Structure 1
Amino acid sequence: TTDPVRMYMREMGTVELLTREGEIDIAKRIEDGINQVQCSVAEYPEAITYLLEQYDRVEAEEARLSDLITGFVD
């Protein structure tokens, strides 16, 4: 009908609104998804040794604490 305003309202109106329980459903999957990739990163030897070579650069005054970690879980 042209008028891109119209073809949006109608394109989004198809997506059905989430139930209060449904929000957590999708959100749980997110946690699962990321946690999968986190563990997958933990399983790489170069990922460790690289982090080692990076922290040795932090202690060598070749970087800053802000450029490597955002803080630990604990």
Structure 2
Amino acid sequence: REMGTVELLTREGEIDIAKRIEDGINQVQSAIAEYPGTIPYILEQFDRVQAE
């Protein structure tokens, strides 16, 4: 009963919801990027990675 009350999606609906998820994740990523501690961490991770 509780599940049936939700309508089924279509292709356009699935793409729209996925786009909203990606948009939210992008906003979160932009928020984390505006942080003095974030970018140096990624830079040092790449520094260790490129050293194999």
Shorter-chain TM-score tier: 0.7 to 0.9
Gaps of 5+ in 2: none
For normalisation by structure 2, the TM-score amounts to 0.72
Number of aligned residues: 48
Gaps of 5+ in 1: 1-9, 60-64, 66-74
Instruction: Give 2:7's aligned residue.
Output: 16
In structure 2, give the amino acid aligned to 1:29. R
Q: Which structure has the greater CA radius of gyration? A: 1
How far the C-alpha of 1:46 sits from its partner, in A, is 2.0
SS class of match (2:38): helix
Identity %: 72
Question: What CA distance in whole angstroms lies between the structure 2 residues aligned with 1:13 and 1:39?
Answer: 37
